[PDB]
Amino acid sequence: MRTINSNQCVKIPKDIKASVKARVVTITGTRGTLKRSFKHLALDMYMPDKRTLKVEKWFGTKKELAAVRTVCSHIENMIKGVTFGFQYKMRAVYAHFPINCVTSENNTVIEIRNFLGEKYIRRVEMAPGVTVVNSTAQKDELIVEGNDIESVSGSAALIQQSTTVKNKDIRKFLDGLYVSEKTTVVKLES
C-alpha cells in the first residue's frame, strides 16, 4: 500500500549523553559506553534536537515499517545496558552426578566437567564485555555480566547448547543448563 508515516520518540533519562552519527546509535552512561551499528538495517532516525530520540520510516510496505519499534526496542535495552548492565543465571540441575561448574578470571568464560562424570571437558568461551562468574551463597548457580543484551543471552545460549544428551530420549534425562531469571545488575535493587 506504501503507507505513509510512523514514528517513535522514547523518553531519555537526564544522566546520559547519547548521539547518532547518522546511522550508529551511541549511548554513554554509568558503566561506560555501548554503541552498536545500524548502517544497513534501513531506518531513519534523529534525536529531535533534545535529549530524546525520534525515528521514522518513510513509505514502507509492511515488513519495512515493522522496523520502527524494533530499533526502538533495540535501544531501550541499550538504556538499561549502560546504566545498569545485564545478568542471567544458570541453575545447573542434574539427576545423579553433581555437575562441576568452575570459573576464574580472566579466564572468566567457563570451565566445566563431570557430565556425566565423563572424559571430555566441555568448554565455552564468551563475548567481549561479558563475564561469567558462579553465584556465591547459592547452590550451583551462575551469574552473567555485561551490557549487550544480544550478547549476554547468547553467552547464556552458548552454555545452553553445551551440554546436551546424545542419542537418547530427552524426556527421560532432563539434565541441562538453563536460564532462570532475566535480570539487570543495578535496576532496581541490583
Add this chain to the structure above:
Amino acid sequence: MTGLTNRTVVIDGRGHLLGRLASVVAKYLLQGGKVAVVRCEELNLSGHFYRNKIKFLAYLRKRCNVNPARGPFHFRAPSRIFYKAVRGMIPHKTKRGQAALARLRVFDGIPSPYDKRRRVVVPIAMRVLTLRSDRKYCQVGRLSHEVGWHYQDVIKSLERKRKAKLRVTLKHNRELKKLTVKARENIAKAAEPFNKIIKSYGYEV
C-alpha cells in the same frame, strides 16, 4: 594524453555493479575503448551472500568430463570474474571480437598507473542508483574469497599501504590548494583582470 575518445577510461567500482557496467563497457568497447576497470573488490550482485554463491557453484561444478584440463577454465581472482560477464557479450570467435580484449584490462588492487590517473563514474552502474532498499546484495571481494581467491587479505596489506600513502598526498595539496587563493589575493589587482570572468562564470566563478 590522447586516444580515440580519450587514451583511457578507468572506472572505480564501489557500487558500480557487475552487470550494468559490463553491458555498458562492452558496448563501448566496440567503438574505440582502451579502457580498464579497477578497484574490483567491492562490486555488487543481486541475491545474497549464500545465494549468489550458488550461482557460482553451478559454474564451478562444470568440469569437462573427459580430460578436465580441456574445458571450463574458471578463474578465482575477482578481477576475471568481472570478465566473465564481458566474455559472453563479445563474440570471441571472430578476429574482431578478440579486437577488444587486448584493449581491456581489469584490475583489483588498484596499482600500476591506474592509481594516479583519475577515475570516473558511470551512473546506471551505481548500486545507489538502481537497487532499492532492503533488497540484500552479495559482495564480490567477500564472495570470491569463499569460492576461493587466496588473496582477500593480501590486497589489504598493500591497500592500506596506499590508503595511508594517499593521506599525506592530500595533505601535501591541502594548504597548497589553499595557497592558490592566498596567492589569488595578490592577483585581483593585476591590471583589471577579473571583470571578463565575473561576467562569464562569475556566480562563485
Add this chain to the structure above:
Amino acid sequence: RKEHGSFYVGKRCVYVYKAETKKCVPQHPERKTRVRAVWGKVTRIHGNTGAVRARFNRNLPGHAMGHRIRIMLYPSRI
C-alpha cells in the same frame, strides 16, 4: 539525443587510411601521396540517440570498424 544529430544532415563523410606507394604526381594541390582516402556523404538520423547512418563513394573498406573516421563541416548553415 536526436535533436543533436540532425545538425549532421547532409555533411560529407571522409576517412583516411594509410598505404605504401605514391603513384601520382602533386598537380592538384600538392600531394607527395602517402595518404589515401575514400569519400562520402551522411544523410539521415537513425538511432534514437544520435547514431546517424551514412553512405560513401565506394563502400567503407570493411576492416575499419574501430578506425577513426571523420566528418568535416561541409556544407553547413546556421
Add this chain to the structure above:
Amino acid sequence: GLLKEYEVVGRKLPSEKEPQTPLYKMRIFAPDNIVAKSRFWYFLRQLKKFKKTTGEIVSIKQVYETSPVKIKNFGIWLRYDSRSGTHNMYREYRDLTVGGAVTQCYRDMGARHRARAHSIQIIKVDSIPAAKTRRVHVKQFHDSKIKFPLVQRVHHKGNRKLFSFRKPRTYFQ
C-alpha cells in the same frame, strides 16, 4: 488511450408496428471515439432485444469533465473476471479527472489481477465526497495538511555523460 468519456443512445430502427422506440442510454468510457460505437452493443446486448443491425446509434457525445482544477475523488464499481471467479467489485482510485480515473483503474486492474480488458465492464462511476472510502491506501491522503518529505525525482538515470565525473550522490541535504 487516455480513456475519454462518451454518452451514447441507441435507436431500434423505427419499424411500423411500433414507431418511436424508447432510445436507451449508456455511459461509456473508452479508448476511442471509434470504438465505443461497437462497445455500446456489448452493453446493450445484456438487457434489451435490439441487435445491430436492427438499431442505430444516435449521437455519441464526448463529455468534457466539469471540475478538473479541483481534486475531487471518485469511487468506481466494477466487474472483473479473473480465471473463473467472475464477480462484483467495488474499488476507488483517487484521480484528478474521471477520464484519468479509468485509465488508472484499468492499469491497476491489469496490474494486480490480470484481468484483461475483455472482462471489465465499468458499471458505475460515483463522485464520492468523503468519509465513505474504505480503501486504506487512499484516505490517508485526505489528511490535509501533511508534512511529507517523500523526496523523489524522476531518477532520470543519470543523464548525458555515460562516463561522468561527479559521483551522483542522490540525497543532497
Add this chain to the structure above:
Amino acid sequence: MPFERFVQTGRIAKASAGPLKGRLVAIVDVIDQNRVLVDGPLTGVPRQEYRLNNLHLTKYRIKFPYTAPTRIVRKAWTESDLKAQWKVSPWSVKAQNICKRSSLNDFDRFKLRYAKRQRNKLLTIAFNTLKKRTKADGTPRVLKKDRRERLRAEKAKGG
C-alpha cells in the same frame, strides 16, 4: 529529524522534467504516491496534473489553505516577496548559468578565454612563493635574493 526537504503545501518548486522546465510553481495538494497538482500564478502556467517525480523542490514554504483559489495565491506570492529573494539565493546565483551561460556567444569568447591566460600569466610568478619553513634561505638564493629584493623592500635593487 534533520529538517528535510518537506514537500508540503504550499511550497514553491522548480521543476525539471516536463513542460515546466523553466517555471517556478507551487504545490496545491498531494494526490497519490506519485502525483501532485502544482501551480505558479506569476510565471505563466495554471494548475494541471504533474508527477511528484518530475520536479525538484525549493525551500520556501508559503501558507495557503489547501482548497485555495489561485487569486489569493496570486496575492500571497507577491506578499511573500519570493521574487525579491529568489535571485539572491546563493546557489540560485548558480541558476544564472541557464540565465547567462546559455548559448555562450562566439562574439566575445576570446575575451571570455584569453583572460584566463591573463590570470594565469600572473599566477605562477606568485608560485614558488613558498612559506614552507625555508626561510632561510636555501643557497643559491644568494643569486636569487636580488630577484627576491623586488618583492619585499622594494627600493631599489638587490642589493
Add this chain to the structure above:
RNA sequence: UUUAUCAUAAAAUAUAACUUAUAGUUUAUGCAUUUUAACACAGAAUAAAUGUUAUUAAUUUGAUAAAGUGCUGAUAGAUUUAUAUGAUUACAGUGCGUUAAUUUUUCGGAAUUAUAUAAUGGCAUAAUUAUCAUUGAUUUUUGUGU
C-alpha cells in the same frame, strides 16, 4: 473549466489573541523568557476560502477535421541515335501602337470605372416538385427584381 463580477451561504482549514502541555531554559520545585515542527476548531476578526446562484475579461480551456497557412532544411534517382523510317509544336510570359484622374514614390510604380455576358452566389418575391417534418425547414423546378 479558468479569470473577473453576483448575492447570500455558512464557515471542514489557512493569516489571525492568549492558554495549557512539552522539553531545553532564568532566578529563587515553580516561575522569567525562549522552539512549539504539543501547537488546547482555544478566541474573535479574516480568506465571507469552502458551500449557493448567475454573468463574464484579449469572453476563457483543448481536442478533430479543412485551406499553399507558410516555409525552411535534406536524402538517393533523372529515360530519351524523337527518322541514326516522321509537330521540335502549342500553351503561357516578354518589348512595340487609345485613355482619364484618384493615390502613393516621386526614379519607376501606383490606382479608375462603366466595355459585354449564361451570369454564379447575397437578398427579395412569384412559382412549383418534393420532404423527417409542418411555427416550419429541407429543398426541386424555376421565374423576376435587386
Add this chain to the structure above:
RNA sequence: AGUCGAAAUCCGCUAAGGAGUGUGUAACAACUCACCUGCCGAAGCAACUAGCCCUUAAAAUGGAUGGCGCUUAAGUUGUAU
C-alpha cells in the same frame, strides 16, 4: 456429592456464580473458567474469494530463458511513444 457419561431442571443467590469449565481428576473437595466490573481507549475479528511467489517436483556425460546476465529489473501484466 457440580464434575467419565446425565434423563433432566429450574432457579434461589446476584453487576456477575451455570444440577457447573476443568488436567483419560473412581469419593467430599481443592480449584479456575464462563460471566460481569477494574484496567486501556482506536479500530479489531470470523470465514470467504483470487494475482503472482510457495510447497509440491526424483535422473543417470557437465551446460542451457539461446549465451552473457539482470531484482524501485533486461523480470511475469495492462500500456503510452
Add this chain to the structure above:
RNA sequence: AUGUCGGCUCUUCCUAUCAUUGUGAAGCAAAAUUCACCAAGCGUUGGAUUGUUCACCCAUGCAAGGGAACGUGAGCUGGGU
C-alpha cells in the same frame, strides 16, 4: 549389413538411502529398533547348482539398497542361443 544374449576386467555418473557424519520424531527407560528431513564422500562382498538378470541357499558382516547409455566381442570368452 549398427557383429545381437550373459558373466569376467573396467572407468563412470544416479538419486526414490542400505548402512557410516549432523539432527528431529515416537506407544524413544536403557539396550535395541522404527519414522523423517539434509546428505553422494569411501564403502555394498568370499561360495553350491545352473548358461543367466532375478530366484533360493551357506557364511562374513557390531551392517551387504537400487540404477544409466541393452553400458562393453578390431579387449576376451562362446556355456546356451
Add this chain to the structure above:
RNA sequence: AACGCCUCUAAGGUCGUAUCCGUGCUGGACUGCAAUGAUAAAUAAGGGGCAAUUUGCAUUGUAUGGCUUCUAAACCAUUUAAAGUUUAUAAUUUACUUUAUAAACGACAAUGGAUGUGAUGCCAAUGUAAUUUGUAACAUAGUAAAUUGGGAGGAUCUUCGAUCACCUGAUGCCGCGCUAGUUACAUAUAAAAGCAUUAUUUAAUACAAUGACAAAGCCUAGAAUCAAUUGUAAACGACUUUU
C-alpha cells in the same frame, strides 16, 4: 516486532556436518611469468655494446593548418536510496579523530565537467603562421636556469626498479633569458583568377619513433650444441655428470 501480547524472522548477530569449496599432496598460458649469471672468435684486424645520444641524409607516427591540446596530481580512509554531506567554532585527538554548537546546503534551475578540483592549455606574438617580426617610453609585478658532499624517500604482470624524485654539507656568483597593462616607432613577411576551389586532403614546424650511410667519443674480451662419455636415467630422445 508490524500483530500492546507473545513469538528461532520481519529485517540482525551465532552453534554445525564424511557434503561443497581452500591449504595439504602431483602436473604447471606445450614456449606465460620473476629477479638473477654470463655475454664471445680476437686483442693486428674486427665483432658486440653504450645510444635513450653529440653529427647530417633518409622514414614512420602523433596534434594536420600553431594549437579537432590536454594533464598521468583528488572526493570517504569498514560502509548507506528518507539515508545525508561540506565547511566553520570550541573541547578532545596522532588523525578535517572523537564531541558539542552554528549554519551552509535543501535527491532545485545547477550537478552529468570546465570546482579544467598542485586550479588547464588556445603560447613569449607586445604583423600571433600552412616562417620569425623588432625598438622605445610608461607603470606595477618581478620568475625561469646551470657547477660540490652527507641524509629522510620510492615497487601491486615495470611507459628505466644496481637508479630514481626531496632536504641538506657546500661548490659557485645566470644576474644568459623573465611576464603583464598603456602609448609611440623601425620593418620584414604575408594575396594558390581559386572567385558556385577543395580533394587519391598536402604537411612543414615540432614531437617522438626510427633505421641506413661515411660521419661521434666511449665500453667489450663467451657459451651452447651434439658427437665421445658415464649411470642416480633409458622403446628411442631427453635427463645427472665428467675431463
